[PDB]
Structures are given as structure tokens and as C-alpha cells.
């Protein structure tokens, strides 16, 4: 039992049955809201300091 980790609970007698390795918050909706890949340095030109 890890504190504040989530589990797989049966609906049978609410038998505490399995434990689910998970992340909790909207992590998917905005956790990975990056701009992934793009390009290289060549199209910058001037703000080099």
C-alpha cells in the first residue's frame, strides 16, 4: 500500500483486490502538452548573445 496511489477495486464486496500503477492528475491532457519536434538553429539569425 503506497500512500495516495490508486488501486483496482472490485465491485463484488469492494474487495481490495489489485493495485494500479498510475499517474493521477490531468497529466495526459496537459502534462504532455509540448510542441514535440520542429527544426534546427539555422533560421534564427541575430540574437546569438
Amino acid at each position: 500500500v503506497t500512500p495516495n496511489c490508486r488501486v483496482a477495486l472490485r465491485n463484488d464486496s469492494y474487495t481490495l483486490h489489485k493495485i494500479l500503477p498510475n499517474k493521477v492528475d490531468p497529466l495526459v491532457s496537459l502534462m504532455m502538452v509540448e510542441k514535440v519536434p520542429d527544426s534546427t538553429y539555422e533560421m534564427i539569425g541575430g540574437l546569438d548573445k
Binding site: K23, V24, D25, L27, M31, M32, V33, E34, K35, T40
Partner: protein, 82 residues
């Protein structure tokens, strides 16, 4: 080209919804940035609140060291100066 270490969540998009609505202590983002310790956070009354929880973490209480939190705006910087 840092291969893991830049997760631009862009931090201001639905600003009255991505910030505080559902993510009160927006630290859900900070749990992202810790549990994806190669990351870089970017952003563009709630803003004052979440500002203060930024300052609750990033004032010397920090796991993967600095991440890289960045905000950008323009033309006058008269956001709340705390």
C-alpha cells in the same frame, strides 16, 4: 534537441481553464515536471494565485533543480509585481 528535457506545456492557453480550474494548486504540472524530471515549463486573480504557488515551489524548494520555468509577454510588464 535536448531529447527529453523540454515539455512545453505552454501554460496559459485556456488560462481560465488550464490554470486552477481542476488544477487548483497547479502543481499537477509540477508533478509532471518532477516525474518527467527532464522537462521545461513554459507560460505566456487566479494568475496571482498560481503565481504564488509557483513561488511556493520555486523559492528554494525544488526537486529536479530548476526545470526551466519561462513566461513571455510583451509591451508593458505591469502584471502583479510579486
Amino acid at each position: 534537441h535536448t531529447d527529453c528535457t523540454f515539455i512545453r506545456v505552454s501554460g496559459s492557453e485556456l488560462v481560465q481553464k488550464f490554470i486552477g480550474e481542476g488544477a487548483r494548486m497547479v502543481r499537477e504540472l509540477f508533478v509532471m515536471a518532477r516525474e518527467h524530471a527532464p522537462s521545461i515549463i513554459f507560460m505566456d486573480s487566479e494568475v496571482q494565485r498560481t503565481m504564488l504557488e509557483l513561488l511556493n515551489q520555486l523559492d528554494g524548494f525544488e526537486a529536479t533543480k530548476n526545470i526551466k520555468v519561462i513566461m513571455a509577454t510583451n509591451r508593458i510588464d505591469i502584471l502583479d509585481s510579486a
